[PDB]
Amino acid sequence: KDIEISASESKFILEALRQNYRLDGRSFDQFRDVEITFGKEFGDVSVKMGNTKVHCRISCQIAQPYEDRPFEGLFVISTEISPMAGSQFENGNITGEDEVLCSRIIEKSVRRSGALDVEGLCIVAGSKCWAVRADVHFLDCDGGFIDASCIAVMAGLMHFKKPDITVHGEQIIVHPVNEREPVPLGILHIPICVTFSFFNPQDTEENIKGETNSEISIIDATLKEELLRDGVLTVTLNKNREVVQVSKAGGLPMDALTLMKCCHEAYSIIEKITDQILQLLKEDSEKRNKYAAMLTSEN
Amino acid sequence: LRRHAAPPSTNFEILNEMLNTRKNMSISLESSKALADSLDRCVDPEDPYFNTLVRIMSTRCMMAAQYFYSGAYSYPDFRHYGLAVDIYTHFTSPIRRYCDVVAHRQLAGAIGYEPLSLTHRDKNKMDMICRNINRKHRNAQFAGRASIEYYVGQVMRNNESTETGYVIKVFNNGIVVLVPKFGVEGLIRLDNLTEDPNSAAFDEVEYKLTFVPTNSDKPRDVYVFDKVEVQVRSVMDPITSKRKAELLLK
């Protein structure tokens, strides 16, 4: 399972960056357009950026909490790749490296960051809590998965609602779904990750001892773009201007002064897209309630 | 935010017994509009203040509203019951309410002026705040009433008068009288309420301490919320050093 590209094609794109061109039609520092569409279920969404397609799912159920944090509920994200999304991939390799490179990000992007209040999953302390689940599916790759799965999970959390609960010791009263309403969830902050994609037009030494910074960085590598890149970097931020994570794990060497200059441009990008989610969550729920207005008057 | 709950019938039935056995009235307690409209009808014509007399008296059993962070509880638990709004904070006085000043800060990101500070996002740090800032407001009006206290506590030091005091409790030990012009209570204990306490009879259902007096002997049916003559005074109790309102019936 190996992608084969000519070195002639390798120089071609490398030339295009040397004349400030890229094959998609975007700018270097331009991001794709995002299509968000929900299914009928809560925590159901289809997210699409041109060629890359994803789908995720949020659910929850009853379990006991750990001994470790006996206060808090349970939550984890599955991101199992299927070779459906591209023939590179093993059947569910949870031990591949790029998978881990997809994993630990979303592990830190959600779980260690804590966008979601796990303490608001405590139904009863130590007895019964929530087990909230996030199964990420990939559909078709043009890269940006780890940015797409960044979004589509956080999209899904802002669309899921959990049903109604009443406690009497052991008499724990899960109510019928349609009499007593499902209840949405508590998001502390909304993180958005950004892939950065790096291209030395030169050898090693002109990056190493060539003092002249000459390295091109772009956003959202397409599939062919992604196969030649030299370093890998993802930052994540919010609306309140705090930096969630940064991960440059090796690759090409890279100036620090670039990275701050990189990460500022992230901010203006992610903010506009964030609010686009925020209206569409409202507007769909508005469309839910206008169709709820088109239901009770109908019934 | 700040939430206010319902004072239930349990805080109101013990008035309702005084409202029914004596005053032949009650409260609604269905909705606090209907309660506030069953409170609007509990006014006596010969005393238009008997409107207001219940208002100052039902005060003592109203639910203590308190500041909180909305992540503590859910949306109808954001209710202000006494002010009929499902959502309620304080905003408009920065100097006496540091609560309002913080609400500027989390508004400062809501208009995009500024990133929010972190401690204004930690519900651990918030619960430490929201109890304490209520506790400072608790530590305010306990002195705010006490501001009036010593400043009343010098008034009746040597300026006594015979006036109208209102019985707010009829007990077996005596009755507690209250001057509406002054707003300071005093138990006129039964023996200094009346001579011959073996002839004094305290009823629990009617809440009457019927007796023959100290200064007289006519069978005095000491009910509630009527009008009396009473001598005011004050002498500081030498075992407590509180300037007690020396209140003595007349």
Curated annotation (Swiss-Prot), chain A:
The keyword Isomerase does not apply. Keywords: Cytoplasm, Exosome, Nucleus, RNA-binding, rRNA processing. One of its GO terms (cellular component) is nuclear exosome (RNase complex). Gene3D superfamilies: GHMP Kinase, N-terminal domain. GO terms for molecular function: mRNA 3'-UTR AU-rich region binding. It is found in: Cytoplasm; Nucleus, Nucleolus. One of its GO terms (biological process) is RNA processing. Pfam families: RNase_PH (PF01138), RNase_PH_C (PF03725). Present with 4800 molecules/cell in log phase SD medium. Non-catalytic component of the RNA exosome complex which has 3'->5' exoribonuclease activity and participates in a multitude of cellular RNA processing and degradation events. In the nucleus, the RNA exosome complex is involved in proper maturation of stable RNA species such as rRNA, snRNA and snoRNA, in the elimination of RNA processing by-products and non-coding 'pervasive' transcripts, such as antisense RNA species and cryptic unstable transcripts (CUTs), and of mRNAs with processing defects, thereby limiting or excluding their export to the cytoplasm. Component of the RNA exosome complex. Specifically part of the catalytically inactive RNA exosome core complex (Exo-9) which may associate with the catalytic subunits RRP6 and DIS3 in cytoplasmic- and nuclear-specific RNA exosome complex forms. Exo-9 is formed by a hexameric base ring of RNase PH domain-containing subunits and a cap ring consisting of CSL4, RRP4 and RRP40. Interacts with LRP1. Belongs to the RNase PH family. This is Exosome complex component RRP45. It comes from Saccharomyces cerevisiae (strain ATCC 204508 / S288c) (Baker's yeast).
From Swiss-Prot, chain B:
It is found in: Cytoplasm; Mitochondrion; Nucleus, Nucleolus. Keywords: Cytoplasm, Endonuclease, Exonuclease, Exosome, Hydrolase, Mitochondrion, Nuclease, Nucleus, RNA-binding, rRNA processing. Residues 153-250 form the S1 motif domain. GO terms for biological process: exonucleolytic trimming to generate mature 3'-end of 5.8S rRNA from tricistronic rRNA transcript (SSU-rRNA, 5.8S rRNA, LSU-rRNA); mRNA processing; nonfunctional rRNA decay; nuclear mRNA surveillance; nuclear mRNA surveillance of mRNA 3'-end processing; nuclear polyadenylation-dependent CUT catabolic process; nuclear polyadenylation-dependent rRNA catabolic process; regulatory ncRNA 3'-end processing. Disulfide bonds: none annotated. One of its GO terms (molecular function) is endonuclease activity. GO terms for cellular component: cytoplasmic exosome (RNase complex); exosome (RNase complex); mitochondrion; nuclear exosome (RNase complex); nucleolus; nucleus. Belongs to the RNR ribonuclease family. Catalytic component of the RNA exosome complex which has 3'->5' exoribonuclease activity and participates in a multitude of cellular RNA processing and degradation events. In the nucleus, the RNA exosome complex is involved in proper maturation of stable RNA species such as rRNA, snRNA and snoRNA, in the elimination of RNA processing by-products and non-coding 'pervasive' transcripts, such as antisense RNA species and cryptic unstable transcripts (CUTs), and of mRNAs with processing defects, thereby limiting or excluding their export to the cytoplasm. Present with 606 molecules/cell in log phase SD medium. Component of the RNA exosome complex. Specifically part of the catalytically inactive RNA exosome core complex (Exo-9) which associate with the catalytic subunits RRP6 and DIS3 in cytoplasmic- and nuclear-specific RNA exosome complex forms. Exo-9 is formed by a hexameric base ring of RNase PH domain-containing subunits and a cap ring consisting of CSL4, RRP4 and RRP40; DIS3 associates with the base ring of Exo-9. Interacts with GSP1. This is Exosome complex exonuclease DIS3. It comes from Saccharomyces cerevisiae (strain ATCC 204508 / S288c). The gene is DIS3.
